[PDB]
Amino acid sequence: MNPDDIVVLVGRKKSGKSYLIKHYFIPVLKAHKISYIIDDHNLSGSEYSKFGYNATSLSDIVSKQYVVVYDRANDDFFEKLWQASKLHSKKYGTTVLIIDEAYYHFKYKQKVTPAIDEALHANRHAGLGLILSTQRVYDLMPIVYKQADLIIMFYTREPNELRWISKYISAEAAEKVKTLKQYHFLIYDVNSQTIKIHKPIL
């Protein structure tokens, strides 16, 4: 794998999306001593509170190695977060920014600020990987899928979703996602146009 990859996770509630982040991605990052920042929008105790230092200021995001951000509010937040995260990776080296409700920052039809643009196109220069998760394929700007290194998808047969997957990801991906069993997930490697059907994690 690669710490500075953009990984997009797509699946409904209880599909196994969060489980994959909590019991695969997070433990493997830790084990390899890859630092991470969790931009957490779910609530006392954030969904990801157990997995890092619960930051209460921008300075905490820069200075703590494993950090959880409670994102429950100004509209320039991502720009602030992004700035803080860049300073974080200068200190800790390559860092994964984990965003569990990615449609907050990368929603379909939203304007693209320079920060969002850097996040999608220059993330390796910035020393920052991304793990973005969303409920439906069509929640995010199509551009996110074009810029992804890896796209992970759980079962769906929703026709709008299949059309988006064919159009912006892979028509072959759109074929295989229809037959995924519970907790199984398709991995599409954007760079090698490779598909792998992965079994449920242990």
Ligand SMILES: Nc1ncnc2c1ncn2[C@@H]1O[C@H](COP(=O)(O)O)[C@@H](O)[C@H]1O
């Ligand atoms: N091996 C497994 N892979 C994925 N999900 C599992 C597994 N075993 C149990 N689950 C259940 O699936 C939930 C994950 O759903 P989600 O909120 O989409 O992550 C967990 O909280 C468990 O209740």
Ligand SMILES: [Zn+2]
């Ligand atoms: Zn956020």
